[PDB]
Every structure is written in C-alpha cells, then in structure tokens.
Design a protein around this ligand. Structure first.
Ligand SMILES: CN1CCn2c(Cc3ccccc3)nc(=O)c(O)c2C1=O
Ligand SMILES: [Mg+2]
Ligand SMILES: [Mg+2]
Length: 308
C-alpha cells in the first residue's frame, strides 16, 4: 500500500471519495484482488477462514447483483536485474518492526497467503461458478487494467496502490459498513498532477517497492511534487546535509513498475458466471473441509437463486 494515501486524499481531495450502500450496485461487474481478499479473511477477528470468507462474502455480492471476477497474484515484480525479490522479504521487514513494539498492526503483516490457500480458493470459486484470472505479477495492477479496458466497473481491494497503478475506480470494503469508492480522475485534478507525478508522490509517501525520503512528510511531499513535478527535480535542489536521499534508491525502477506494470491481456478474458455445483460443493466444504452441511446447502441455494 501507499503510507497515508487514504488519509491524504480525505484532507486534500474529499470529493474523490464517496461512501455508498451495497444496494446501489445491482448489475455491476468488479475485479476483486483475490490475494489481498484472502489476506483480509485470514487476518480478521488448520484455519478455514479463507474458504469461509470466500464462500459467504461472494454469496453476499451475488445477492446484491454484483458480478465479481477474482484476480490472483503472479510472480512479484523485480526492480533490479541482479537480485531476486521475494514477497517474504516484506513479511521479514514486518517482523523487525513487530518485536520493537501498533503491535497488532505488524502482527497482521506477518500473515502469509499460502499455496494451499490459493488452490483451495480457486477450487471453491470453480465449484461456485465464479470466474477468476491469474495476473502475471501484482493482482492490484491487473485489477486496474481490467477497469481501464471497460471490462469491469471497479477494482475491489483494500490496497490503495491500485490507484497508483492507474485504476480509474477503486471500491473498498466490498468483502467486509458502506462501500468506499475512490475516483482517480478527481484525485489528479484536485492535486494538480498528472499520473506520472502522482506515481512520484506515492513513492515519497511510502510504497512497498522502495524507500521514501526521511524527513519529507506527506504535506511537504505534495508541495515538492506540485512545484518540481518529479523526484529527479526535487533531489537536484534539496540540501544534501538537511535531507539525504536513500543509499542505492530504486525510485526510478519503482516509477516504471507503477507506470508500465506487467498486467494480463483484458481482451484474452471472456468472463462467464455459471451455476454452482451443489453436489461437488457439499463434498468439498463438508466432506473434506468439515463445514456444516446445512450452512453450506443454504448458501448454495441463496447463490443459485441470485443468478435466476
Ligand atoms: C497478498 N497481499 C498480502 C498483503 N498485502 C499488503 C499488506 C502488507 C504490507 C507490507 C508488508 C506485508 C504485507 N500490502 C500490499 O500492497 C499487497 O499487495 C498485499 C497483498 O496483495
Ligand atoms: Mg500492493
Ligand atoms: Mg497486492
């Protein structure tokens, strides 16, 4: 995510954020960041919470006429050609910050979406008749591309860096309370920045891909981006003794990653929603995952009715 982005937009561009009832979305298609959704199900208060949340939160969407397409993460982006970055390195950064102390905040970040979580959620979605795509890299980047192409109305994720990846519309809290909807065009207009400049502001705010300048906070960053437009222009004017830039700063590699990310082909995708398979759903959820037969049978019934 982008450190303090949702709070900064609430201060500078409040009219880009709108809170709406889930009843206002009947008939809409959304691209859900499945990796972040599974993560959110695992951290809420062996485990089957990933399947429980996937089954009941998807049935709720279908009961409110929302048609979801789940997008799963592929390989992590590589910023340098010499090194091999792994998503577990971010969880290692979260473990250092945890033992220092916001204690609960860093405890959530340790949680891994395992191989078994992804495969069992894709198995559940197939039985339910819900389509899913595998993104070549970040699912939030592919959710944004599906929106730009007009394939779906919005990207549904808790990840603010979906705006950084260019998603025109971002819906938050769909798998949780009203839906929080962000409009990128309105954000860019109120800040007086184009997408390239917004990506550099997000870098200075704090992203998962590189460091941000120590000493330059959120208000100072907006100002410096409004005046100088780029990070290369800001660094060439900062006092190197007052504000030293990070050593071996990957800000250029992070910028390219956000502007031209590796995304799925939206035209290769032919979205279909099909009838749930009740017999195979009971055998998997109850027979294999020890779920209550009556609670599953009831959910499948609500889901079948939602289509017809
Ligand atoms: C599958 N997950 C796991 C959680 N997650 C987070 C949350 C986080 C932040 C920093 C280190 C670890 C996890 N931020 C993202 O930016 C992000 O993309 C994800 C994600 O997709
Ligand atoms: Mg992210
Ligand atoms: Mg993600």
């Amino acid at each position: 995510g982008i450190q303090g982005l949702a709070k900064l937009i609430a201060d500078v561009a409040p009219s880009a954020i709108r809170e709406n009832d889930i009843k206002s979305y009947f008939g809409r298609k959304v691209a859900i960041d499945a990796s972040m959704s599974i993560y959110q199900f695992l951290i809420a208060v062996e485990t089957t919470s990933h399947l429980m949340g996937m089954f009941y939160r998807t049935i709720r969407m279908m009961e409110n006429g929302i048609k979801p397409v789940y997008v799963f993460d592929g390989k992590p982006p590589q910023l340098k050609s010499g090194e091999l970055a792994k998503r577990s390195e971010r969880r290692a950064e979260a473990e250092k910050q945890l033992q220092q102390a916001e204690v609960e905040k860093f405890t959530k970040r340790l949680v891994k979406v395992t191989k078994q979580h992804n495969d069992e959620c894709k198995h559940l979605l197939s039985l339910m008749g819900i389509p899913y795509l595998d993104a070549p890299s970040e699912a939030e980047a592919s959710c944004a591309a599906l929106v730009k192409a007009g394939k779906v109305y919005a990207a549904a994720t808790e990840d603010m860096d979906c705006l950084t990846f260019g998603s025109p519309v971002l819906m938050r809290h769909l798998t949780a309370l009203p839906i929080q909807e962000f409009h990128l065009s309105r954000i860019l207009q109120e800040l007086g920045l184009n997408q390239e400049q917004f990506v550099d502001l997000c870098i200075l705010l704090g992203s998962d891909y590189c460091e941000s300048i120590r000493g330059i906070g959120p208000k100072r960053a907006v100002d410096l981006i409004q005046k100088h437009k780029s990070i290369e222009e800001i660094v060439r004017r900062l006092d190197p003794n007052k504000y030293p830039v990070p050593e071996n700063w990957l800000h250029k590699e992070a910028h390219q990653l956000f502007l031209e990310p590796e995304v799925l082909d939206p035209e290769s995708v032919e979205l279909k929603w099909s009838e749930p398979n009740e017999e195979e759903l009971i055998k998997f959820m109850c027979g294999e995952k020890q779920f209550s037969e009556e609670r599953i049978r009831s959910g499948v019934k609500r889901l079948s009715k939602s289509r017809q």
